[PDB]
Design a protein around this ligand. Structure first.
Ligand code: U2F
Length: 541
């Protein structure tokens, strides 16, 4: 399908101009590519990469050569050939569903979501990754942040009715206090981990909580017991036995997010891609649900006045209202429908007796050894769902993307922090360093890095996305299609990504749980929180 050698000598020549060694290198590599029946997909890709590099060498050596137009179209052909390679040679996806819940006890709602996948994919092995060393992180973060709420409001305990005490101001001051407490903990942690390098996270955490917040070690130990017991009874896989992950470059980043920043979503970001690289299968966030049988509601037309999203949520809410697969599932959106439409839902669902007629199964999936497939929503690609064969090329590209992004982050963050200054001063130093390194190829990314110290504690802070989330995936796909590594400026258009997207039929993303984020919160939510905190402080609690 890709042009052969003579087909390219035809594209590049003028009789008068000579054939240089830098051109013959291209010719030879192309000929070699067309004699690779003995080789694998990844080897074929690597050969296309060689070809592209040689072509770029020629174009950069003879800047105005008459060949350069032909060769520039040749490069387009190379990209096309990569996409053919991806699409025409697929291999079976390992039948594993990987979930992650780290930092604390797993909730019944998560289990109930997971159990639906179990119910309709009995041929799949299910893992729920947990960290047996770190059951107390969520308790630590909650204790600290609640103490901070209290100290803030006490500092403002006579301006509560002052309309100048905006939720914004509240979260700024609280952020100051959170930074101080959080650095206190981190320093204690590093010291203890110095005089005893094998102390586990939960030991240090529980003695910290005892010393500084009058918590009873006995109670925390009972909590640990109950969490271990619960996850063991629900397909748990201990991160502390995932040896390749522990021994790898990325484990320090996982523990940076887990222990220092208390961002379990980022830690899960770092773990999920390693699970796919080392094991293969499909990763799912615990607030995702199986796909709906495509023909189920084919008879119910969507009303003109409703968005596509709204309609999806109401599909699921109908399923749960009539079948009650998941208890206490909201009906907020379904209840807003015409009585006739609701009736239509009830009829269709009444005609069905078994869950297999509602939720579809994954079955025998296959994918390219080159690719990682990623879910998508109105907003763009989103790594709440992922599919990959073991050790796919893109899984390695993604691991590398994350590692480089954390290198850029920490080269500026760590010096700033080791100056033992307060939140605003540290922030200013760190931002100054990031700006000094910013340029045309990384601006967006660096701008988002400037907010890192606030993740999880302040409204509308989404740095994780650019560091360990979808932007690293997009960057990895661009790396693949540009025959390189280390892209920082994404120029792909949605059409480009569509080659790497998971079929919508394979996941139901518009779930109730999706709506509420565990690592981020928006302004309305921040305002509600502020008002409720004021009420609780007034009443003591
Ligand atoms: O206490 C906790 C709290 C959360 N987690 C993990 O974090 C995961 C993400 O939660 P969630 O839906 O809240 O994140 P989301 O809001 O969609 O953020 C996106 O972007 C995020 C970053 O890219 C990405 O993490 C996410 O997948 C995106 F869709 C959750 O499924 C667990 O694996 C945890 O392990 N322990």
């Amino acid at each position: 399908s890709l042009v052969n050698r003579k087909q390219l000598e035809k594209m590049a020549n003028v009789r008068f101009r000579t054939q240089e060694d830098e051109y013959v290198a291209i010719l030879d590599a192309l000929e070699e590519y067309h004699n690779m029946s003995e080789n694998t997909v990844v080897e074929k890709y690597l050969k296309l990469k060689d070809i592209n590099s040689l072509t770029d060498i020629y174009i950069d050596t003879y800047k105005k050569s008459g060949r350069n137009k032909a060769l520039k179209k040749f490069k387009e052909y190379l990209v096309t050939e990569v996409l053919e390679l991806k699409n025409n040679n697929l291999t079976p996806v390992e039948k594993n569903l990987h979930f992650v819940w780290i930092g604390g006890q797993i909730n019944d709602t998560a289990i109930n979501y997971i159990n639906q996948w179990k119910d309709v994919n009995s041929d799949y092995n299910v893992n729920v990754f947990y960290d047996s060393n770190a059951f107390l992180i969520n308790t630590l973060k909650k204790t600290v942040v609640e103490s901070a709420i209290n100290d803030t409001l006490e500092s403002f305990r006579e301006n509560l009715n002052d309309p100048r005490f905006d939720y914004n101001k509240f979260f700024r001051k609280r952020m100051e206090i959170i930074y101080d407490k959080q650095k206190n903990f981190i320093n204690y942690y590093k010291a203890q981990r110095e005089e005893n390098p094998e102390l586990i996270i939960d030991d240090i955490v529980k003695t910290y909580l005892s010393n500084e917040y009058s918590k009873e070690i006995d109670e925390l130990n009972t909590y640990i017991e109950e969490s271990l017991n619960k996850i063991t009874q629900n397909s748990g896989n201990d991160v502390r036995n995932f040896e390749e992950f522990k021994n790898g470059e990325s484990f320090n980043l996982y523990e940076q997010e887990l222990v220092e920043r208390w961002n379990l979503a980022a830690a899960s970001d770092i773990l999920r891609i390693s699970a796919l690289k080392e094991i293969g299968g499909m990763y799912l966030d615990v607030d995702m649900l199986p796909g709906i049988q495509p023909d189920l509601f084919e008879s119910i037309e969507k009303p003109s006045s409703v968005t596509v999203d709204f309609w999806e949520m109401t599909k699921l809410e109908a399923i749960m209202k009539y079948k009650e697969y998941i208890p206490e599932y909201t009906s907020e959106h379904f209840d807003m429908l015409d009585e006739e439409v609701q009736s239509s839902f009830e009829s269709v669902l009444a005609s069905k007796s078994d869950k297999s007629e509602i939720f579809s199964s994954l079955g025998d999936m296959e994918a390219s050894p080159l690719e990682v497939k990623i879910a998508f929503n109105s907003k763009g690609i989103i790594n709440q769902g992922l599919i990959s064969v073991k050790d796919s090329y893109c899984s390695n590209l993604i691991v590398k993307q994350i590692e480089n992004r954390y290198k850029i982050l920490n080269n500026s963050l760590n010096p700033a922090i080791s100056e033992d200054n307060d939140f605003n001063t540290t922030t200013n130093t760190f931002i100054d360093s990031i700006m000094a390194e910013a340029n045309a190829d990384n601006g967006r990314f660096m701008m988002e890095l400037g907010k890192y110290l606030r993740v999880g504690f302040f409204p509308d802070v989404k740095t994780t996305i650019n560091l360990s989330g979808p932007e690293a995936y997009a960057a990895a796909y661009q790396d693949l299609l540009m025959f390189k590594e280390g892209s920082m400026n994404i120029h792909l258009i949605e059409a480009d990504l569509r080659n790497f997207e998971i079929s919508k039929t394979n996941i139901s993303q518009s779930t109730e749980q999706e709506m509420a984020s565990l690592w981020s919160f928006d302004d309305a939510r921040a305002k509600a929180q502020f008002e409720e905190y004021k009420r609780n402080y007034f009443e003591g609690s």
